[PDB]
Structures are given as structure tokens and as C-alpha cells.
Amino acid sequence: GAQVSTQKTGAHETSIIHYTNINYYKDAASNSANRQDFTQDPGKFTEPMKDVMIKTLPALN
Amino acid sequence: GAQVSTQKTGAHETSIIHYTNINYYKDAASNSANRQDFTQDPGKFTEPMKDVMIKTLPALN
Amino acid sequence: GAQVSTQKTGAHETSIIHYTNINYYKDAASNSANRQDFTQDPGKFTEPMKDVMIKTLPALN
Amino acid sequence: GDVQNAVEGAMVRVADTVQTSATNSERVPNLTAVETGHTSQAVPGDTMQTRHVINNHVRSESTIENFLARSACVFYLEYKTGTKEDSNSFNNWVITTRRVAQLRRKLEMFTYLRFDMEITVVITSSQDQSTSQNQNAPVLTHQIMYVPPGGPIPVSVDDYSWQTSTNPSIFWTEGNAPARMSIPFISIGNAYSNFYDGWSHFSQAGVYGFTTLNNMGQLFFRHVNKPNPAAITSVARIYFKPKHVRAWVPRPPRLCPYINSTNVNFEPKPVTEVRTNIITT
Amino acid sequence: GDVQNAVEGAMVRVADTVQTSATNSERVPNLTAVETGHTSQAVPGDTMQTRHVINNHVRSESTIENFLARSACVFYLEYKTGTKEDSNSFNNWVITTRRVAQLRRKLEMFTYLRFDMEITVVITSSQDQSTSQNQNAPVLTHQIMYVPPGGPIPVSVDDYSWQTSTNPSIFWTEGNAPARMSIPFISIGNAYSNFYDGWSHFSQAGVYGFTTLNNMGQLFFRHVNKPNPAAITSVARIYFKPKHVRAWVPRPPRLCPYINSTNVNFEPKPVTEVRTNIITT
Amino acid sequence: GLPTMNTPGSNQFLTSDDFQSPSAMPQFDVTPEMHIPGEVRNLMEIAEVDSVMPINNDSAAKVSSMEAYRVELSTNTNAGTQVFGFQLNPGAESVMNRTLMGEILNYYAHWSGSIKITFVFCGSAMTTGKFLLSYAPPGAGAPKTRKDAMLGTHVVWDVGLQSSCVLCIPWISQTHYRFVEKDPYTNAGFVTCWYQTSVVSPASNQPKCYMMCMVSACNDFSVRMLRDTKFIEQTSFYQ
Amino acid sequence: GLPTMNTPGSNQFLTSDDFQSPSAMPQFDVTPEMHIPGEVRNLMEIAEVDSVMPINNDSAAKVSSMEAYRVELSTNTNAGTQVFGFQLNPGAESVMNRTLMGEILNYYAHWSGSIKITFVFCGSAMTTGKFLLSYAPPGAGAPKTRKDAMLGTHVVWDVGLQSSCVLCIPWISQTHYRFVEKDPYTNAGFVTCWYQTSVVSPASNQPKCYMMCMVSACNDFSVRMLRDTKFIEQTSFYQ
Amino acid sequence: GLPTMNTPGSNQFLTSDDFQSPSAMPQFDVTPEMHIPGEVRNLMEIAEVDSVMPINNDSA
Amino acid sequence: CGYSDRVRSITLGNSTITTQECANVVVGYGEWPEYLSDNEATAEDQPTQPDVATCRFYTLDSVQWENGSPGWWWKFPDALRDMGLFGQNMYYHYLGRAGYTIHVQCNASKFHQGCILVVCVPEAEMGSAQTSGVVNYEHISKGEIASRFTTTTTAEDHGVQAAVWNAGMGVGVGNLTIFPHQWINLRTNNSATIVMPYVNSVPMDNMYRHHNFTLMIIPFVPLDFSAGASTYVPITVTVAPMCAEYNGLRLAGHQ
Amino acid sequence: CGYSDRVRSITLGNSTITTQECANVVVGYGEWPEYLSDNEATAEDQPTQPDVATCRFYTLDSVQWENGSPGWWWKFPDALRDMGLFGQNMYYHYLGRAGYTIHVQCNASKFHQGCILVVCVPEAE
Ligand SMILES: CCCCCCCCCCCCCCCC(=O)O
Ligand SMILES: CCCCCCCCCCCCCCCC(=O)O
């Protein structure tokens, strides 16, 4: 039971190349590093507010 | 004829990752250790009684 | 997910032999050299003209 | 999703710049009050006329995984080929990550850290000078034995302990690719704690600091071969690579040099390097 | 299509010759005016009666890829097994491609060049003569460390720098197949520039030439082993292979010998070799 | 059986590699996950937070004290007087060198993005003033007068009830990435601050007051080519 | 043919590995299975069985005899007198060290679960008494009076026709696992026993009698991190 | 496990070979492509351009 | 509307603080404190939750801000150990869990200037003045009395290194802002409110041994005013526990 | 709403002026400046329009207001003749047309008094 996934490739002038991975061990610890996952969320640090602040309005009014 | 089975992985905050195994030898002895099987039954040791004992009732009555 | 493609072979007296390739790495950089691609276009160098020149007509007329 | 499933990924790209024009509005997008503890969300289009730009840049070497997952040297240990009468014929190392400066500084940027680890170990040997230093010797095997907390400890190079009936060991012959193991997560908490502010005793005493929580056993190293007619010194360099990392609560980077590996003691240093004047080209 | 997809190809063949007959026409296909800057498109059938020929020749060793993609030696560096007191116990090389004559000439045929690269390195060791040159020594591991621009630099064979917490390193034991890495594209521009006509300073001064753009870090080389009772000299030969190449703007080949590797300086040479007379059999 | 050959690159340990390897304890039971508030998963989340810059930096005395952070403003100063100046080049310029953004940057050799400097006036509540915040692109040296500065990209901050105005310095560069290390080829121009009018105060009030400057990375920013820092070293193992 | 490269970790024997390997006798005929009563298939099945604790343990004399197991009770003892006390910490506390549960534990570095101590009164059949069985959580030291003990988790066992009352010691811990080895960071509190009233006897009967204490692991229990024991050693091969 | 044998030609570096090999920086972000006028992709495109011959060549 | 965003009323228990100048309220890491779930429980015994009796605003001691003063810190939950029934529950229970509303109060007239950083640092492990020495309890906390920073590097034996600019823990003070913080800049607001949730690596812990976080108040711009315009301006720190629950009951004590 | 009519932000080119005390903005004679139409053209040659490069806030010199001082005047477009690329285009071209946003800035504390007339007089001979 192989898994297929897309390789990192840059942009091009105005695509998809796959690679194959199979796990050979019984413990999830033995698996390769998870280097693909670029999700983020600055929210928790950059705006830890209770009341929402609208950018265009004055901060204190 | 490959076999697919699930790897040991811990719990998560509120899954399944497979691995592949194929045997290459003609004798069952050559196979990998059977490390996954967590079945048990304390019964034979903890209560080797003839008459069933109900926990909530007095032992001798 | 294997890829199949045709090998370089010469002409014959009056065919197709395939080979198999699978990528094993997560970065497109790790892939084999792209040695098959024989496309070309002399146009840009050999005739960098604005007005089309017809071979059979005199160059200046 | 799962961070131990490495074939499952995600994709996102850096934000684009949308074209803007001149305004003479009644809205101020670049006035804010720092006091709030709120970081301004100004973008270039708010104070200039910008063109339309498309960015295809992607943050991809600033992921926590990619940042931490490279094999750092944590310690090297030395041991000669000897007899039972020697007390350098084997050696041991109490596992810690605070000995080296570089890796320590990286880890200490997060308060709580949860990861699996790949341990690789490069053992190099050298001939010691002697009268009989042109003696012939065959290849040397080395044994690395992990002793978990509260297990038997070797008192010599040769005693029962080395039998290893349930202790993980690696036997590695020279002239082969470096020995490598993967270790799962192993804390009794829910994450490794790089900082502990507290005491080991409920009477507010004993040991202050991180020391109290760390306890990870020790690595005992020896030569398997019987001694040759001259000593050979070996030095094992231990490499650690944190993979499948998850990190919580970011902290300021270290500024002052470290002094000890059992406490956070420091002596105060200047904030930043001096410059010539407050106006400088 | 994509030049990093190597299983996708294309096919084309050399043009055929179509049969022609005698003419007495009013069209001249072999008169043209060179002045235009237009190359004539005359084909043999325009000035001879030719037979019908089918060509199955294919241009296939004159593709840019096939031309450039062979591993060239770019530099070799030498270093002895020493102590901290020696200043030849380690060595380093500032990365450049201008040291060798052959590969340089090939690259310089294109103004702009974009490629990924396979770096292979062959390290060979030799015993230095000494009184104790029949001393026994076990196998030697070597460490190659890449230091990107503006990183820490080793001052001795043994210092913190060699810990390599985020610097790529290769540990290679002797008697194994040569060490090999692949490197992606790495410029801050959109192609490597083999020629830069311009200045480093806006006042039309400083450094003239290509030097200004090149900056690629350095390779530090050392032995990992502690010294034996006699020195061993090692020489590492670095091989580079450009794969996935794309090339823009062809230039005339070099004619004059190179003199320096930081500028294009030359002293004028004859255009071509002299021959006996203007009529020669 | 199956045959099979080695290729160059066999039996060599590469630091940045990524392969599977056997476990050392088969079927270990990992401790179940819990929550824990505040989770980073990308260093840029840190870089986007406001650190305070130590602009004042003229001598060792003030550099080993709180003085470093507060830029001194004074009343009755002629209009068009430079408050301060320094060339922009984070991670190699002393001013931003050891701030949060700076520290993150020094693990990389290439940066790109836009920077936003939030100027907060921490004077009296009865004092007023207007300042011209200028950013001149490179290729002509730093401005020497208010007029020179005026020609560049600038915001005129009128101090009032809203304490702070942010100068968003836009990315204008030939190349897609600059070096973090100082290099003559890539420069990022000069950020200067000038009195647009003057600081005016009422009767009984302090003449001198102070402003402070926050710095952070905008929402489009990125870094490439991971490398070791130069701000820490040792000569032996810690004990 | 097929090419193919080695990676770090080739040609190294790891003790805890798990790979296939060729047989030494092809097609050997294994002897057919039969039944055999009583099959363990998990060590916890053993840990759940009641062993008897040697609480009495004051001197070598009684420790090399049957005396060790019997805790002496006596008639006409004032109420609120401590019968015995020891801190809970199995596999490092002498009292439970060499019992069945203890022995199993010493092959592991981490335990978790709840323990149940079954107190059986083996006195006369005409004697009566009531005892307070207390378990104090850690963080305040062992109780010093019946009142101190009372505040903790406790069962009042009234002796009667049913010989034995079981004190189920519940798991209350910060962490999901404690160390088996003694460590200051994790402690498990103090189990103490006190006279709730007194032992009363009739006319012609012995004044002194004895109780005995069983210990076992409850139905939720687990162990992690397999390791060597310290209770056996040799200096040479046995012959 | 899987067995497996070497053949002649193992552990030898050949200059003109072509194999995959691990990257030295995982997940590096390559700079996006732009255009650039004038692209060769085959040396014959160069050979088809007119150079001028130095026929006169009788003496240094 | 008739609302203004400068007036705020926080009522918790039988205690209400009002403020007429403030700038919003920082909820630490976006998460509001709440009770432990049954998926993250480890303890088996039934928790007590005293609700209203132990949640309410405890006004701790107030220190005077002066021109030369360098800063102050307090350590939580340690500081609250003498505060009413919170103190008592903490004294009789092995395990405790709770979040906290930190509300720092200060005020001045229009003719004063000065700006204080108010920051809640989780897990602040601190150095020692003697770098071969080891700090002991009495120089880490004085209970509900503020521990002062110093602006002179030298200090007594078992002194904690507390030179302002390195925050007493070897990091540049200017970067402390990464943790939940506000600023009381005299001219705009006059109070800070940080709702700090429980952050630890383990679900509940012992309240004496572990110190969850340190409240640091550092004056970045010194207090200044012109002659004859008052000279005494105190800073009062008021804190309220939220969602406090305790497991493991036994006799009172430390050891 | 959250708006106040005392705060205003004018962004033009790469130059933004903010002000937190103002009273509206006077659009001269009700008409907003705009480009010449093809019904009012006289010149036949194609105009250049430098847009962003020549539209942006040029801060001219600032004089000090004192108790005795009587007043000041500046003449436009003459005043702008040394201001950047505006100056250059004006120097190399026979004909020019443009409107202007005049923004006068001044400030004081509450314990000052005084009142200035700011007026744009067309064709002041
Ligand atoms: C031969 C077998 C070897 C097994 C080695 C087991 C090593 C355990 C490693 C524990 C790493 C702990 C990392 C702690 C990080 C931190 O909090 O600073
Ligand atoms: C051990 C890790 C080694 C990593 C080596 C990184 C080498 C970077 C190589 C850059 C090649 C640049 C080619 C420039 C071509 C040119 O313009 O002349």
C-alpha cells in the first residue's frame, strides 16, 4: 500500500511531479520527518484581543 | 501478495498510518516477532472460583 | 506510482522498449537529469527580422 | 493533520499586494495605540499607491520542523582500550542537551517542546604512541549500551551488567556507516520542559531549576575486543536530530553566554553593540 | 515541458532532402544581402539537382543538458592530520568555478545560466615519511562542512564551530563510494550571471566585474580523528555536475588564455594559426 | 537474489538527510496529548510581533542601562532638525541587530519582505508636536536636510490622542531577496526622522520628553538558506 | 541491476531490532500443539494477584523468619494509636519491594495505576475491634495523630464475620506516570493504620493477636520503559 | 529482509552517470522564473549563425 | 449608540472593578480560562470547585513609583498564599488549577509623564548573582510584597541577578513583549488588564513547588513631572483567580 | 459608528499626511481638479502626465510665528520650481497645467491663543 504525493517545485513562467513513499516499520516513530506542512496562524500572538479592532477605525474612540 | 496493517500511534487531541510487510522465506519460523496483540484475560488467576461471587454481596453469607 | 517511458534506440531496417522510473525524494532537485528533449528553434538567431523575407524573392527590391 | 504522517502536507503562499489609489478619506489606517498590546496590521497599500504584485514566495524554511531538524553534535566522550585495572577502559555519559552552546540556544526558544528523536553516533579511533606502535591489530567492535533510570551500573569494563538482557545496545564494527536509532517520545509529562521554575521539595527547598525534571538514564561505552599490545584511544561523537516536533509558547532568544549546564546563571552583558552617533550614515 | 521532470521527453529529427529538377526560372534563391543581418536559408536542392534522401539523424548530443552535464573537477584542496598548533590541520575553499580552465570556458559560452547541481567529492589520503612511518593507524573519517555566507568561521581544527547545528555536513569514512549531494538553485537573482558589467558602488567605483555578484560561502575540511604518531596528508578533489540546465544569450567562445579568476583580463593573441599561402592544396 | 548495485553516496552520513530508521523500543506507549495554549508552528509568527528598538546607542554607559531605548526630544528646537538617522539593513545593523526580528533573521542568509516601524510618543499629555518620518531608498546616500528627506517616501505624524503612527517601509528592490549579511551589492536605504514643526509645551511642564520605536515584520516576509548564528560560542563543554 | 544505495545504520546489530532471517533447518516439522491449563499472555495478569506484604521488618532476626509477615495487635491499647506507617512508593520501598507486584515493577522505569491493600485480621473468633485505614496524599509529610490521618482518604474497617476489608488507594497524580525508582519529584504519599477503637477480648483468651496485609495492582495499571533489574548479579559463569 | 546481492560496478564513480541523490537543503524555495529574451536550447542553433572566415592568413 | 470603549466594568464574585480609562483587554494567547475536561483528567477523585468563594479580586500590596526606581516583580500563584479562602484551599490540597485576571492600576494628572511595561512571563527561571552560587527561596519571593529589581550588578549572597536590562534571566529586556503584555503610558490609559489562562505542561500541579508565571512591571520611560505637582504616585496590582479547582485533600502543611 | 470627523488622512503618491485636529476640507469653488478634456484642448501634441512622480507632498520652508510678526505670502507655481521632478518638468516644458492641495500645519498647547487667516488669492497683482 504505497502513498503518492507531490514534490516541492518552484513557480514557472506562464507543475506536478510525484514521488512514492512506503513505510517499512511498525512504529510511527520510525517515519520520516514531516517537512511538508506550511500552515500557520499569527492570530494568537499578533492580536490577542477580546474586542475586535478594525484597522481603518481609530484604536481608541 | 503484500499485507497492510496499522502502526502503533498514540492518542491525539479531539489516526491511521499503514505500513507494508511481505514475507520472503518458506518457513514460518523466519517471520518477524508478533509484537502487536494486546489481548489478555486475568480471569484464570484472579478468580479461579466454582461459584460466581458478586462483588456487592457479602463473600460468605 | 511508477512512470513508464521509451528508451533511446536507433533506426532499423524496413522499435519501442520501455524503462521504468520512480522518484524517491521529496525535492524536485533530487531528480535525474532531463536528457530526453530534443526541441529547438533556430528562428530567434537565424532570422531576427521584422519583415518576413521570402527565400526565392530578392532580398532588396 | 498528524505530524507523524509525513506524506500528508498542506500548501499556503505569502500574501499579495493589491493596487491602491490616492485617498482623502476620514479613515486613518496607520494610527493606532501601542498601549493596547496590539500589533498594527498596516500593509504597504495603506500609505502609498502600490501596483498589483503577485507573490509566489512560500515560507518553507521557517517551519518549526525544517528549522530544528538537522543533526547537531551534543557531546563527545573518550575511552581507551584497557583492562579491568584501568579506569578509562570504559566511560559513560549522563544524557542531557545542555552541554553544547548552539543546540541549547535553539531549543530554549520554546518553553514546551514535544518530539521524537534520531540518534546517530560517529566513533573514531586513533593509535596511541608506544614502543610497540607498529603492532598489528584487527578491526575493533564497540558497544554502546543504554541504561534507563535506576538500572544496574558497570563498575568495570567486564562485569555481568554488559550482558544486556533488556537494555538496548548497538554493536558497531569500524569501517561501516554510522550507527543510528530512532527513539519515540519518552517524557512522563505531556511535553519536555526546557524551563521549570520551582523546587524539588514542597518546603520550598532543594534544587532550583530544570534539573529536577530531567532524568533520562546514561550511555555506557566500551570496547568489545580484548587489549592488543598497545592502547588505542576512541572518541565517540553523539549527534541528535529532533523530528516530528511540536512547540508551544515562544520565549526571547538567549543574550548572555551560558556558564553552567545545571542552571540558567549568567552575568549581565551590554544590550547591543555601541555605534558612533545617533545620526549615522 | 518542465525541465525537472526528466521522464517527459520530446522527439524531432533532422530535415530531409526533397528531389529537385533543373530550372530556368526568374527566381534566385541563392542571392541575398548579408547587410540585413539575416542568414541565408539556402538548402542543397536550390543549386543542384538532388535525389530524395531520408535522414533519421537526430541532434541529441548537442542538447544543452547533454553538453554540460558531465562531472568536471573544479578544485582540489590539501590538509594534513595535525593538532591545534598546526595551521594546515584543516583547510578551506571559497566556492567559485573560475579556478579551472576547462569548465570555465564551457560555462562562459552563455551569459545567463540557471541550473541545479550534483556535488561529488573524492578524498584520497597518503602516508607522510617519518621515522615512525610503519606506525599502525586505523581508518580515517573526514568531515566536509558547508558554511553559508556570514556564518561562524573555524579558527582552529577544534572549536565550537564544528558542532554544525544547522550547517550541512558530510562525514565520510575511507573505503566507501565517493560522497555526493544534490543542491537546488540558490541565486537571489533569476539566473546565475557569468558576466556582470558594472560597479559595486553607485559612485561608479569599487569592484569591476563578476566578483560583485558571486558569494556562495565556503567549504571547511578537516580530519575527525585525533593525530597518530605520524602525519597523513589528504587531498580532496571536488567534482561539480550542472543538471536541469536552462541557458540564455549565447556568447562567442574564449580565445585568449585566462590569467586571473577575479576578472576577465587577457593579453591579445593572434586570431588564428598562420598558413603557408592563400592558395594551398 | 534480486540484483542490485550501489551508487556514489552510499555509507555516508549527511546532516540534513531524511530516512527511516528502526525504533529502539518496540511498541512504546506515548503519553496522550493535551492542549496547552499558545502554539507556534512557524517562526514568522514570532517575527510579526513588535519588539522595541534600542536606537539611542551612542556610548557604553547608556547601552548598559535603560537609557538605550528612549530617544530624547526637547522643546524649542528649530524646525527641520534631524532627530536620528541610521541605514536600514536588519541583522547587520546594530540598531535592529538584537531585537526579535533581528535574532530570527541571523539564522538565515536571505530575507525578503516589508518592515514596519511603529513610533510611539511617550511624552506628557499636554505637550504636542509633529514629526516627519522619512525613508529614502539607496543610491544617493543619506539625506542631509529636511528638504532632501522630503523627496523620499515619508509620513507626517501629527501627535494627538492616538499615541503612535506606523511608518510602513515598502519593499523596493531589484532582486527577490537581499542578504542578511552586510554586502555592498544590496543595500536597503536610509530611515531618518525630523522635526516637522517643534514640540510645544504649556507653562509648568517638563521641557524634555521621550519617544520609543517598535519594529516588526509585515505580513509578507520570508527567509531562506538556514545557517548558524554568530552570537553564541563556547570554548569547552559547560558544566 | 536495480540501483540502490546504503544509508546510515547499515551493518549494525541492534538488540531490540526485528527483521526476518533465514531458517537453519528448512522445512522442520514442529511438534503439534496441545492445551496445557493456565496461560498467561500479559504480565499484568500476574500483577493483579494478591501477594502478602512483610510489613514487620524492624530487625534481621524477624526478617529471616516467618515473623516478618505478621503485624502484632494487642488488647487494651488506647484509641488513636498508630499500628504502622510507611510511605507508598512500590519498587523502591522495602515493604513492597520483593512482593509479586514489586518484582514485576522492577523491570520497568515507569508505572501508573491504583493499588489495593487487603487487610486480613487473623485473630481469635471471639475478639473484636475497629481500625481506621488512612492514606494521606503527599505534600505535607506523614500524619502524626489520628486527627491528621482522619483528614486524608480513609476507610473505617469494623472487624466481624467478613475477615478482610480492602483499602483501595486511588491514583491522584499530576503526571500520567511516576518513576519506579525513588525520585524527589514524584512521591505517592503515606499509608498509615490506626486503632479506631481498641481490640476487646473475652475472659480466657489470648491478649495478643495478628493481622496480615495483601497487596495487588488494580484493573487499571500499566508499565512502560523496559529495563534490567538490580536484584541479581554474578561475577562469573555458573557451573 | 529482502535478499539481494551486488553486481560488478558497485561503489564506483562514473563521470557520465545519472542517478538520484538526496538534497542538501530540504524544501528550499527556488526563486520564481521570469522570461529573459533569447534562449538557446541546442548548440546547433548557434552553429547555424554566420561567422566571418579569416581566409587571408599568409603571415603573422 | 451611547457606548464608549474607554469605560469597562469587570464583575467577578462579589467584587467589581470599574475603570474609565483603559485600552481593551488582552486575553492571553486567544484562550479564555475554563475547567478541566474529562479527556485531560488524570486524577480519579472528585474535584472541589469553590466557585464564588475563591474567585474575586484580591488587592495585593502597592509600591510607589519614583523617578529612580527600576522595577518590580511578583510570583504567582505563590503571592496569593495568604489571600482568604484561596490560601486555605491551596494549603489543604495537593493539586490545584486556576487561571487569573491581572489588573494593574495607576493614575496621574496631565502634567506627568512616564511609561511602564506590564508583562506576564510564564516560566521565568532566574539566575543567581553569584554564578557559582545557587539562589534560595527568600530572594525569589517575599510573598505578596514586591521583589525589587536593581540597577547595580553586585548583590548579596544568594542574591538573584537582577540587573534591569537583562530582565533577571539573561535575555534582552526589549524582547519581553513576546509574552502577553500591555503598557500603561500616562496620557492615554491608566490601567492594564491581562486575562492569563492556565499554561503548564501537565494538567494540574502543586501550588507551592511550582511557580506558574511572574508578573514583571518595568518602567521604560521614567516618571517625571514639574515641581510642586504631587510626588507620590503608587501602583496597585489587583488579581482575581478564575475557574479554580482542587484535587487531593489531606492535612494542612508544606512538609 | 466609530468615526470622528476630527481625524483625516490624505494620501497622495508616496506621501501621507495625517492630522488629528482639523475642521473639514475646503474644495475651492466646489470643483475638484481633473485633467483637460478634448473639447478644451488647443495644443495638438500629445501631453505627458507623470502621475505619481510629480504628485506628492512637497514640504516648503517654515517660518516662526511671533507676537509682533505681521504675515507672510508665497507665490505659486513659482515656489515649487526647485521641488524634485515637478521642477524638472516645469523647466523642460513650455506649457503646464495643475491643481494643488495646500495644507498649512501649526500647533500649540492649550495655554496659547492666536488666530491666523489662511487664504488662497487667485491673480493677486
Ligand atoms: C543505544 C540506545 C540509545 C537510546 C538513547 C535514549 C536517549 C533518550 C534521549 C532523550 C532526549 C531528551 C531531549 C530533552 C530535550 C530538552 O528538554 O532539553
Ligand atoms: C556539504 C554541503 C555542501 C553544499 C555546497 C553548496 C555549494 C553551492 C554551489 C554553488 C554553485 C554556483 C555555480 C555558479 C556558476 C557561475 O555563475 O559561474
Side-chain angles (χ1 to χ4, degrees), chain D residues 93 95-98 107-108 111 113 115 117 119 144-147 167-170 181-184 186-187 191-195 214 216-219 240, chain F residues 24-25, chain G residues 14 225:
Chain D
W93 176 62
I95 302 178
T96 188
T97 55
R98 303 306 180 100
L107 297 170
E108 286 188 359
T111 315
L113 211 48
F115 50 85
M117 177 162 278
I119 304 182
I144 304 95
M145 169 180 64
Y146 175 43
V147 176
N167 288 355
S169 298
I170 317 176
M181 300 185 291
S182 186
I183 315 299
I186 206 169
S187 307
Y192 305 107
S193 300
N194 293 335
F195 293 90
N214 293 349
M216 298 294 179
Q218 311 174 91
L219 300 182
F240 284 178
Chain F
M25 289 81 77
Chain G
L14 166 60
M225 187 69 268

Side-chain angles (χ1 to χ4, degrees), chain F residues 66 70, chain I residues 63-72 116 148-151 164 217-223 233 235:
Chain F
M66 292 300 293
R70 67 182 78 105
Chain I
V63 66
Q64 64 170 302
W65 184 11
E66 299 181 62
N67 187 17
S69 60
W72 306 275
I116 48 173
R148 296 177 174 277
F149 285 109
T150 189
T151 193
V164 196
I217 303 185
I218 303 182
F220 273 72
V221 179
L223 169 66
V233 44
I235 301 177

Side-chain angles (χ1 to χ4, degrees), chain D residues 61-64 66-70 72 100-110 251-255 258, chain E residues 147-152 160 163-168, chain F residues 43-44 46-47 90-92 96-111 178-181 221-233, chain H residues 25 28, chain I residues 175:
Chain D
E61 295 180 67
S62 51
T63 313
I64 297 295
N66 295 315
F67 177 61
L68 295 171
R70 292 193 175 183
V100 290
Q102 294 200 125
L103 184 61
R104 180 173 182 179
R105 173 170 171 152
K106 288 175 53 180
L107 297 170
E108 286 188 359
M109 288 174 59
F110 308 110
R251 301 178 59 80
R254 185 66 168 184
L255 172 56
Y258 305 105
Chain E
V147 176
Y160 76 107
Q163 287 167 12
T164 58
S165 294
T166 49
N167 288 355
Chain F
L43 297 175
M44 293 298 108
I46 311 180
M96 298 160 286
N97 202 224
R98 307 309 305 256
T99 64
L100 285 168
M101 184 174 73
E103 296 278 60
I104 297 295
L105 283 166
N106 285 108
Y107 284 103
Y108 296 97
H110 299 145
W111 68 284
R178 288 178 167 143
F179 294 107
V180 172
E181 188 183 8
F221 201 90
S222 52
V223 291
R224 304 188 297 159
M225 187 69 268
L226 184 53
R227 61 174 175 81
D228 296 6
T229 194
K230 303 184 64 174
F231 299 139
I232 194 65
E233 71 299 298
Chain H
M25 289 81 77
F28 189 82
Chain I
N175 296 344

Side-chain angles (χ1 to χ4, degrees), chain F residues 51-78:
Chain F
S51 40
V52 61
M53 297 195 294
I55 301 195
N56 194 9
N57 189 218
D58 299 349
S59 54
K62 49 180 61 174
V63 164
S64 302
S65 59
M66 292 300 293
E67 295 177 65
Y69 297 106
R70 67 182 78 105
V71 181
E72 180 167 289
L73 298 167
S74 183
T75 195
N76 296 345
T77 303
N78 297 347

Side-chain angles (χ1 to χ4, degrees), chain D:
Chain D
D2 192 10
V3 294
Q4 303 188 257
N5 187 6
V7 91
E8 177 180 3
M11 187 61 185
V12 73
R13 300 179 181 275
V14 172
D16 296 352
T17 302
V18 184
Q19 171 173 293
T20 53
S21 303
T23 52
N24 183 355
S25 59
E26 295 79 59
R27 49 179 178 277
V28 268
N30 64 342
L31 294 183
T32 193
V34 155
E35 291 78 60
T36 308
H38 171 268
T39 289
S40 190
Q41 296 303 292
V43 63
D46 296 350
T47 47
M48 301 82 205
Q49 299 183 248
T50 50
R51 67 185 299 176
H52 179 58
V53 183
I54 301 179
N55 288 258
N56 295 122
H57 299 316
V58 51
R59 295 162 173 186
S60 186
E61 295 180 67
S62 51
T63 313
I64 297 295
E65 179 80 65
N66 295 315
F67 177 61
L68 295 171
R70 292 193 175 183
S71 306
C73 180
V74 297
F75 195 65
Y76 58 85
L77 190 70
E78 182 170 300
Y79 54 100
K80 299 188 183 295
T81 298
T83 52
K84 301 190 303 183
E85 287 65 62
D86 296 352
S87 187
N88 48 85
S89 48
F90 68 102
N91 205 356
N92 67 100
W93 176 62
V94 179
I95 302 178
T96 188
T97 55
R98 303 306 180 100
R99 254 66 188 289
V100 290
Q102 294 200 125
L103 184 61
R104 180 173 182 179
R105 173 170 171 152
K106 288 175 53 180
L107 297 170
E108 286 188 359
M109 288 174 59
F110 308 110
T111 315
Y112 305 118
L113 211 48
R114 173 180 178 92
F115 50 85
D116 297 351
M117 177 162 278
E118 294 189 4
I119 304 182
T120 310
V121 55
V122 185
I123 308 96
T124 39
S125 301
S126 54
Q127 177 59 21
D128 297 349
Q129 61 181 292
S130 190
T131 304
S132 300
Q133 59 189 2
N134 58 356
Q135 55 87 24
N136 174 39
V139 192
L140 309 174
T141 305
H142 303 264
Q143 177 174 5
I144 304 95
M145 169 180 64
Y146 175 43
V147 176
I153 287 172
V155 184
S156 55
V157 62
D158 179 13
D159 67 339
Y160 76 107
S161 300
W162 297 103
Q163 287 167 12
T164 58
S165 294
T166 49
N167 288 355
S169 298
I170 317 176
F171 295 90
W172 175 88
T173 311
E174 289 180 64
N176 290 334
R180 170 179 292 186
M181 300 185 291
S182 186
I183 315 299
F185 183 78
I186 206 169
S187 307
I188 55 169
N190 299 63
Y192 305 107
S193 300
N194 293 335
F195 293 90
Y196 176 71
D197 175 8
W199 304 96
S200 57
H201 293 84
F202 301 88
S203 53
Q204 310 300 70
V207 177
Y208 186 71
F210 55 88
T211 299
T212 301
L213 301 183
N214 293 349
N215 180 8
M216 298 294 179
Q218 311 174 91
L219 300 182
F220 290 80
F221 293 79
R222 68 169 181 168
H223 287 272
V224 183
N225 307 77
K226 298 179 60 178
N228 295 111
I232 304 95
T233 296
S234 299
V235 49
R237 308 181 65 89
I238 308 173
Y239 291 85
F240 284 178
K241 180 171 63 175
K243 59 182 180 181
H244 309 157
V245 198
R246 300 184 64 178
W248 296 265
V249 186
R251 301 178 59 80
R254 185 66 168 184
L255 172 56
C256 305
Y258 305 105
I259 305 180
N260 295 334
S261 58
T262 51
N263 51 68
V264 68
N265 295 352
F266 68 100
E267 67 188 1
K269 306 302 301 183
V271 173
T272 190
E273 186 171 297
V274 180
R275 68 190 177 119
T276 308
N277 183 234
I278 187 161
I279 293 165
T280 297
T281 302

Side-chain angles (χ1 to χ4, degrees), chain E residues 148-152 160 163 165-171 176-178 180-181 186-188 190 200 202 212-213 215, chain F residues 7-9 11-16 110 139 175-177 179 181 184-185 224-230 232-234:
Chain E
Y160 76 107
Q163 287 167 12
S165 294
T166 49
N167 288 355
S169 298
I170 317 176
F171 295 90
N176 290 334
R180 170 179 292 186
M181 300 185 291
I186 206 169
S187 307
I188 55 169
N190 299 63
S200 57
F202 301 88
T212 301
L213 301 183
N215 180 8
Chain F
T7 52
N11 308 291
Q12 52 93 3
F13 173 34
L14 166 60
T15 295
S16 302
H110 299 145
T175 46
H176 289 92
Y177 287 88
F179 294 107
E181 188 183 8
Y185 182 48
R224 304 188 297 159
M225 187 69 268
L226 184 53
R227 61 174 175 81
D228 296 6
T229 194
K230 303 184 64 174
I232 194 65
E233 71 299 298
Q234 58 179 43

Side-chain angles (χ1 to χ4, degrees), chain G residues 114 137-141 148 151 170-176 178 184-185 220, chain I residues 42-45 94-95 202-205 209 248-255:
Chain G
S114 302
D148 294 350
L151 295 168
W171 178 247
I172 303 177
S173 185
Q174 41 180 297
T175 46
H176 289 92
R178 288 178 167 143
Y185 182 48
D220 53 347
Chain I
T42 41
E44 292 176 352
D45 65 343
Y94 174 43
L95 300 175
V202 65
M204 305 183 67
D205 206 4
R209 293 195 306 175
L249 169 59
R250 70 298 188 261
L251 57 139
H254 303 301
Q255 288 293 75

Side-chain angles (χ1 to χ4, degrees), chain G residues 3 16-18 34 38 41-42 58 60 77 90 106 152 168 195-196 204:
Chain G
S16 302
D17 71 358
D18 186 9
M34 61 180 282
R41 56 171 62 84
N42 201 100
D58 299 349
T77 303
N106 285 108
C168 188
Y195 288 87
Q196 176 65 302
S204 296

